[PDB]
Design a protein around this nucleic acid. Sequence first.
DNA 1: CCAGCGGCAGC
DNA 2: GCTGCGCGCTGG
Length: 144
Amino acid sequence: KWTPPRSPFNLVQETLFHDPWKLLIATIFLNRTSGKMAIPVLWKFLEKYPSAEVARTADWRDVSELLKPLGLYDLRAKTIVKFSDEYLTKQWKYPIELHGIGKYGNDSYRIFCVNEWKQVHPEDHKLNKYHDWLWENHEKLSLS
DNA sequence: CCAGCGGCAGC
DNA sequence: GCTGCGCGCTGG
Ligand SMILES: [K+]
């Protein structure tokens, strides 16, 4: 089974990879928002909405109240509910096919959730740091 | 003090 | 191709 390695850069994707919905929600939380502020709120969100199954039933106004100190709160609250609906009920191969996930979320999924990191060409700086480091260290970490 | 900064959809 | 969304943190 593909386990992405921990890096000296401590991307939150390294800990969330096991649950692709939670990883992708985290990428949404990090859209133009510092991890220092977003990630504490992420845990409160996941306490209230532990799964896509329940998040797709949420009132976006309740989600936006949680997102308020992060900015982009009405936008992302509506995104999270629709994303969670499509994640479960739309046929998809890569999550870029889903509302709210672009290249950054998709590259994140393809590096962390599935074993496709060698095919990914990130433009995100933090993904580039992790991905460059992976190419330089994957042999030492005994990964293919 | 406060401008700059930490993705995505819809055009 | 550009713009709206958007708070709190950063640092001279
Ligand atoms: K998409």
